[PDB]
Structures are given as C-alpha cells and as structure tokens.
Structure 1
Amino acid sequence: PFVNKQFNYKDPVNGVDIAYIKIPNAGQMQPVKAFKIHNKIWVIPERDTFTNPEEGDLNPPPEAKQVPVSYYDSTYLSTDNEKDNYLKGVTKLFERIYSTDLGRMLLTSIVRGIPFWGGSTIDTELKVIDTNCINVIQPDGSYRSEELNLVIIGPSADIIQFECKSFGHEVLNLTRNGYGSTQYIRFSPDFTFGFEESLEVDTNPLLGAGKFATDPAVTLAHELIHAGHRLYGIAINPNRVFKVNTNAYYEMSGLEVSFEELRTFGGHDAKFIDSLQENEFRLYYYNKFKDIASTLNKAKSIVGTTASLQYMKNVFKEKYLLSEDTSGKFSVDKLKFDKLYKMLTEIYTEDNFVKFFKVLNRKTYLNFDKAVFKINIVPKVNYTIYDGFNLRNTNLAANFNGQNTEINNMNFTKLKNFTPG
C-alpha cells in the first residue's frame, strides 16, 4: 500500500525496512538487499535468478523456441542506479494503485491475507509453512525467519514475462485450498506493451487506430489481483481453460485462455462463465474455508516462539471473516463468504481498475500486443500517481495522448515488434 518513506537503493540496511534476505529455495542463494515498502510486502530490485532453480542465469533460450512476445537484455537491473530507479518505479505504482478506492481495498485485502499456518502433520497443532517466510539478517548478523505475503521482484531472462508465482508445500495446493501462500511477482516498471485502439468519433474510419501503450499501473494491479486470489487460496486450477474463436469448428480452435486469467481480466469477457460454474467454485471454496474454521476450532498448540495461538486464531478470523460465538468457536458465514468472494473475484478485476484510473487499455485480455517500449515513470514530468502518462494541464491530458506512442513519442522507446506469431 502507501509507502511511508521514499526509499533510496543506497540507503544502508537498518533491519527495520531495509535488510539483507534470502528466499526459501533449493539453490545456494546469496543474500540480497531488499526493501519492506509496507507491512507484509517487500521489493527486491534484482533480476529473479533465485525463485526458479532452472533459471539461475539470464541466458535467453534458443532463437527458435523464443516466443514472439518476448525480450532479452542481461544489462537490465545490473547497476545500482537502475535498481534505485526500479525501486522508485514500483513504489510509485503502488501509490498510484493505492490512490484509488479500489486499489486501497485490494492492498488491504492483500496485507491481511496471511498464508494459513497449516504446516504440521499434527492436526491440532498450528505451524507456519517455511516457504511463506524469508530469512532476514538481523542487525547483529544472524538470520531470522520472517513472514510476508508479497514480494515484488524483477524479471528473469525474459524481461517482459510478468507473473505471480509461489512455492508449493507438498500434497496441498496452497493457492486453491483456502490456505494461501506468499506470492512472488516478477514485474518491471521500466517497460510496457503497445496495443492498437480506434478512438474514431465519426461514421467511417480514416486516420485509423492509434498506437497506445498500457499504463504500467494496470499491469501491476492485474498481477496483484492474481496475488489476492492466491493468498486466499481461491485461485482457479490452471487446467480450467476456455476456448475462443470466430469460426471455431471443433476440438481446440484459436488460442486458449484460463479461467483464472479471464476472471482476473473481468469485463464483458468474464461473463463467459455460467453462473453455475461460478457457483460451483464458490461452494467448493466455501467448504475449504469451513475446513479452515474447523482446524482452528480443534487447534490446541502452536509451533514457533513468535505468536500465541489466540493471536493467530484472531489473525485468521479477520482474514477469512469467520463468525465466532460466545464460547469462541469459529464458523463460516455463508453470506459473508459470498461478499468477500465477490470482492476478490468480481470487484478486483483489471477492467474495474482501468475504470478507476480513467486510462486507455486493451478491450479484451485476448487483445494481442503489438510491441514493447522502454519507459521512465520516476520523473514527475513523465508520469504521476494521479494521471499516469496523461498529465493534466498539458496536451497529454487529452484523448489519452499521454499513452499515444506517436504523440508522446519522447516517453516511449520501441525495442522489438512481435512479428512472427
């Protein structure tokens, strides 16, 4: 959410909000300087060569296997000045998101979505799952395990491959069982995508569609929406995908889109999901919350020297919005679950964010992207928390000129056009 201080990459560690940390990975990782921009949320201004074991180097894949919608550059995020710019770019986008009521609500839901403490083989024992924490070097030197819900990290080899990923436990699908898990978002504020849009205002089209760029804040929000689903364990299985096409004869016609993506994008598209299908998951996740409520009712002990069992029971009461009687027994409110579920899945959508931001965006998640641009969101004369690229009191503030790559060409440097396909 809102970032109290204006972090500088050079600022010395203080253990408090600036520290050296290590991610729970099966690889020999060295500590990296990280920043806690808000309770439960950290930013690691580094290329991500830590999360995925088979992605420890920024080496691009064979030219052939290289998808048209991709881009490589090993120099990106290699210098302190770049890391500083990255840090400030991410912070600024969080403020832009938080500056809206919708963004404020999502960030609050994210902060309260602490992954559930279901890491024990003993059902009556609450225990934290190790992959939902980071190891932080304390001021004195030693490492200490700390919980967090979200980490924003730079991309790995493919600079424009943004995503929301996390570590799995064992036989538990943490992102789909109501438990949730710490989310790692590969993202960059230094690049954005191009898309065509026809703002025609007459009968017939003449000048044609203009070339516009996606507002980075929309992209981050999209990613935070995925994080919101995942932290609450209500993400839709990725094997649930929809088929779309104009003359789709039969048996896989036209690229496919997952239910998760569609739901996240929202808009008229999201309506491509029957109320039955939408009600089946609602029920499915309603039962998972009930199992969580039942686990907390039978809990008798807790592991760790951090929090007390009552504290964590309260923490999860606030997260799942559980009902509590006089004896202190928890239960899931059928109606309250409907509210929280609708919020996380129908209110927090890319479409609604586009509306609150008042910017131009692709009309469909399916709407292909033309090319990729280099941008600089840090300078106030290029982009602001409230207007984005469409600076008020300027010509950029008209007809989404600020996002027009031709008009505001000085704020967009093209790198590569997706020609192959």
Structure 2
Amino acid sequence: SPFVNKQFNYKDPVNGVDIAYIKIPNAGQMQPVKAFKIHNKIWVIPERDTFTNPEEGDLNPPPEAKQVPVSYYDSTYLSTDNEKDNYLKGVTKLFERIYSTDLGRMLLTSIVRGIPFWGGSTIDTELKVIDTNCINVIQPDGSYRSEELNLVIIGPSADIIQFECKSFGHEVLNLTRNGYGSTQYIRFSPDFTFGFEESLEVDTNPLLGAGKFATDPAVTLAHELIHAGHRLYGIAINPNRVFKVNTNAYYEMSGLEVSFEELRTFGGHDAKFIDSLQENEFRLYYYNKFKDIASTLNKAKSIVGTTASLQYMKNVFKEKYLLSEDTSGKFSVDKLKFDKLYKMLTEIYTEDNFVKFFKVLNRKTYLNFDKAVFKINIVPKVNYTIYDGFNLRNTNLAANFNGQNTEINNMNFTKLKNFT
C-alpha cells in the first residue's frame, strides 16, 4: 500500500490526468511545464523554479562578490531530462519514507485534508475557490481545465539550497495567518543535502567543522512539509516575529534573529524559546480565526464554480478544521477539539520528532551553522532505502549512523562547497 501509486518516468507520455502540461500562477506568461500528480492534491514539477518569483526569472547568480558563503549556484542543474527523471523518483522515494512512519503518515493525511478555504467570493454568503489556489491543466483540445491542489514540489531557484515553502497572496486576505490556507509551493531537491557535525560544540561554531555528517533529505523535506501543514491550515506565525538569539554568542555577535515559525517547526528545545505569553496569544488568536470560518460556513447560501453541493463543500471543511456540528446543523469550534488540532500541527509535526522516528542523526538545534553541501543520489537501493535511508540494514552502515558519515560512506556524498 504505497503513498505514490505510480512509478512515474519523466519520459512517460502525458495522459492529461496524473501526467499533464500545466500552468502555475506566475507574473509572466509562462510556457506550460510537465507536472505529475503523485497523490491526491499533490503535484511534482521537476523544473527549476523560474516562475513563482517575478525577479527570479533566470538562474543567473549574483556577482561573485555579493555571494553569501552559505549558498550554491549551478545554472545547469535539473536542466536535462535524465536529472528530471531522477529528480522525480527521488522526490517520490522521499514521500514514501516519510509516509512509512505513523507520524509522517498523519502529516501527509493532514495535508491532503487541509483544503485551502473557499473565501474567494465577493458576495458575503456564497462560497468560491480562490483562483491562485488552483492550477491550469492542459486538455487534449489545447483548452485549459482548472484543477485544485494543496501542495506543489518544485525545483530550486537561483540559490539551489534555498529550500522554502511559499504560496501566493490575496489582495484583501491573509491566507497563511487567517485560517483559510493556500496552495503551497516547495522549492526542494532530493539531490543535495547539508553537512553538519555530531559534536554540538563544533556544530554551533561558524569557523569549525567540515560537514562530518549528512542531513537525511527526508527530514529536510519533512521540515518543509511542516511549513506546509501550518500554512495550509492558516495558523502560521508572521515571518517578522523573530527571536533575538542570546544562546549563541556567534549569532549574538552578528546580531542574527531567527523567526518563531522556523523555531516552532524544528521543535524540541528550540520551540521553547517562545515564552508562554507568546504561545498563548497565538493559540487564542487562531482559535478565533476558526470561529470566523465557522461563521462564514453558517452564513453560506450558495456555491459557485463546481458541481459539488453546498452542504457537501461545508462537510469538507468540517473535517479539515474539526468543527462540531449540532442538531440544527450550525458549525462551532469546540475549544478542546481545536486545542488537539492546534497542538498537532505545532508541537507534534516537528523536525525533531521526525528525527526520533527516522532514527537518523540530525542537527540538535535550528541555531547552528551549515558546514558543507553534498551531491547525493538516493534513487539506487544500494545508496538509500525507503525504510532505512542511508543507514542500510544488516550492513556496516547501520551502526552509529555510519550511513550518514560522509567519509565512511564516502561514495554516497560528493562535496561541492565548503561553508566553514
């Protein structure tokens, strides 16, 4: 029972259903690109992302002098068909590994159920889909069929290791912080991984360590999938709510500040930098946001743009936000039901808890310094397996996380750049 039913090949013909030419919301008039529906409401564009940002239309790097040490530029990556095939199967295998844990199995089920809310209409009482929460799928005629989706895995932009989770905004709505949600676009590559040190003292020092170990890409993708789970349920923290790092002299020296959002995503001790007063206000702030959505659903008189019934589309959102329905049929938010749902996306879906269940070596905090970038190929089963990743079972790579050791398993990790 796999999460991704098909063994997609980039070379596969477009059938117009789960393999089709599509158009993403973009500032230009982009040419359609090939995308694969690996799962319900999840698509994979194995292209470099020149479309989401109007100022990053090209993959040219900045002047050699304006480049920051922690970056890697390569305009030729993911440009040829063979890398597009390998990229697609790598992303697919990474979903299988996440899904093979009850924790990731729940995360992926919460994402597919987290439909961006239908707050698009200009009339108070009718429900409508926000256009930017959809994609344009090409038909055989050449006509364009609009289709809804929740997640999109796309290739990196100019900065190859600038992994992130982004969505398109609304002129009058704050979809990521009002509960509604929005289709998420993740820049991610299964062919690259960051180097880090097992020794915490070395890992928190900018000037030491050369990337003794390698991050497991399923944790990296699991980290960005948690960003999606926050933004899809509309409970993300404003990215300008930053923490004045006082626990790392090297951060304090440079005056760095990490956003509460990423600290929450990492979890563990990191998520405790947020003080109880700050956590309390957000929970209450978004508990009220679900009440506004429950109020909008109760004042729903019509539905536009689909053949689904009004009652049916309310039900999709009762199951998403876990609203309570009384005898008369009016939706409400049960504070305890919400608190269970709120804690799930904030304290349970964390990079830390995922490392515990993958049983991999990982950074022990978000406040560290990346030591190197490696080129990996996770598609061969002699390199990387769904159930064990790099630390293959029964081999010498299982003990002491040896499979993640970039010198003991020196054939699976090719160093490209030294940040240290």
- Is the 2:203–2:368 Cα contact (8 Å) retained in structure 1? no
Q: Which moves more between the two structures, 63-72 or 247-256?
A: 247-256
Sort the Cα spacing of 1:260 and 1:204 in 2 relative to 1 into closer, same or farther, 3 A: closer
- Is the 1:243–1:253 Cα contact (8 Å) retained in structure 2? no
2:63 maps to 62
- Is the 2:205–2:368 Cα contact (8 Å) retained in structure 1? no
Residue by residue, what CA displacement relative to the aligned partner does 1:320-367 show, whole Å, maximum 9, x if unpaired? 000001221100111000000000000000000000000000111011
Residue by residue, what CA displacement relative to the aligned partner does 1:95-133 show, whole Å, maximum 9, x if unpaired? 000000000000000000100000112110111100000
Residue by residue, what CA displacement relative to the aligned partner does 1:120-153 show, whole Å, maximum 9, x if unpaired? 1211011110000000012333101111000000
The alpha carbon displacement at 1:201 in A equals 16
Measured in 2, the distance between the counterparts of 1:201 and 1:186 equals 29
Sort the Cα spacing of 1:56 and 1:390 in 2 relative to 1 into closer, same or farther, 3 A: same
- Is the 1:47–1:156 Cα contact (8 Å) retained in structure 2? yes
2:389 maps to 388
- Is the 2:211–2:372 Cα contact (8 Å) retained in structure 1? no
- Is the 1:210–1:404 Cα contact (8 Å) retained in structure 2? no
Q: Which moves more between the two structures, 341-350 or 136-145?
A: 136-145
The alpha carbon displacement at 1:311 in A equals 1.5
Sort the Cα spacing of 1:342 and 1:373 in 2 relative to 1 into closer, same or farther, 3 A: same
Measured in 1, the distance between the counterparts of 2:253 and 2:211 equals 32
The secondary structure found in structure 2 opposite 1:399 is helix
The alpha carbon displacement at 1:64 in A equals 2.3
- Is the 2:195–2:211 Cα contact (8 Å) retained in structure 1? no
- Is the 2:203–2:209 Cα contact (8 Å) retained in structure 1? no
Measured in 1, the distance between the counterparts of 2:70 and 2:245 equals 20
Sort the Cα spacing of 1:288 and 1:131 in 2 relative to 1 into closer, same or farther, 3 A: same
Q: Which moves more between the two structures, 252-261 or 409-418?
A: 252-261
Residue by residue, what CA displacement relative to the aligned partner does 1:166-201 show, whole Å, maximum 9, x if unpaired? 000112110000000000000000000001113999
2:213 maps to 212
Sort the Cα spacing of 1:201 and 1:148 in 2 relative to 1 into closer, same or farther, 3 A: closer
Sort the Cα spacing of 1:402 and 1:282 in 2 relative to 1 into closer, same or farther, 3 A: same
Q: Flag structure 1 segments of 5+ consecutive residues without an equivalent.
A: none
- Is the 1:197–1:210 Cα contact (8 Å) retained in structure 2? no
Structure 2 residue 171 is the aligned partner of structure 1 residue 170: yes
Measured in 1, the distance between the counterparts of 2:329 and 2:26 equals 38
Q: Which moves more between the two structures, 252-261 or 331-340?
A: 252-261
1:46 maps to 47
- Is the 2:21–2:32 Cα contact (8 Å) retained in structure 1? yes
The secondary structure found in structure 1 opposite 2:254 is coil
- Is the 2:90–2:190 Cα contact (8 Å) retained in structure 1? yes
Sort the Cα spacing of 1:393 and 1:249 in 2 relative to 1 into closer, same or farther, 3 A: closer
The alpha carbon displacement at 1:307 in A equals 2.4
Q: Which moves more between the two structures, 276-285 or 37-46?
A: 276-285
Measured in 1, the distance between the counterparts of 2:395 and 2:175 equals 48
The alpha carbon displacement at 1:204 in A equals 19
- Is the 2:197–2:209 Cα contact (8 Å) retained in structure 1? no
Measured in 2, the distance between the counterparts of 1:250 and 1:183 equals 30
2:371 maps to 370
The alpha carbon displacement at 1:73 in A equals 0.8
Sort the Cα spacing of 1:383 and 1:198 in 2 relative to 1 into closer, same or farther, 3 A: same
Measured in 2, the distance between the counterparts of 1:207 and 1:23 equals 42
Measured in 2, the distance between the counterparts of 1:241 and 1:279 equals 17
1:161 maps to 162
Measured in 2, the distance between the counterparts of 1:68 and 1:336 equals 46
Measured in 1, the distance between the counterparts of 2:10 and 2:210 equals 40
- Is the 1:245–1:254 Cα contact (8 Å) retained in structure 2? no
The secondary structure found in structure 1 opposite 2:162 is coil
The alpha carbon displacement at 1:310 in A equals 1.3
TM-score by length of 2: 0.95
The secondary structure found in structure 2 opposite 1:267 is coil
The alpha carbon displacement at 1:63 in A equals 1.9
Q: Which moves more between the two structures, 1-10 or 398-407?
A: 1-10
Q: Which moves more between the two structures, 403-412 or 265-274?
A: 265-274
Instruction: Report % sequence identity.
Output: 100
Measured in 1, the distance between the counterparts of 2:340 and 2:223 equals 21
The alpha carbon displacement at 1:203 in A equals 21
Q: Flag structure 2 segments of 5+ consecutive residues without an equivalent.
A: none
The alpha carbon displacement at 1:275 in A equals 2.1
Q: CA RMSD in A?
A: 3.0
Measured in 1, the distance between the counterparts of 2:211 and 2:161 equals 22
Sort the Cα spacing of 1:253 and 1:245 in 2 relative to 1 into closer, same or farther, 3 A: farther
The alpha carbon displacement at 1:406 in A equals 1.0
Residue by residue, what CA displacement relative to the aligned partner does 1:13-59 show, whole Å, maximum 9, x if unpaired? 11121111001122110101100000000000000001111111111
Measured in 2, the distance between the counterparts of 1:202 and 1:65 equals 25
- Is the 2:164–2:187 Cα contact (8 Å) retained in structure 1? yes
Sort the Cα spacing of 1:156 and 1:210 in 2 relative to 1 into closer, same or farther, 3 A: closer
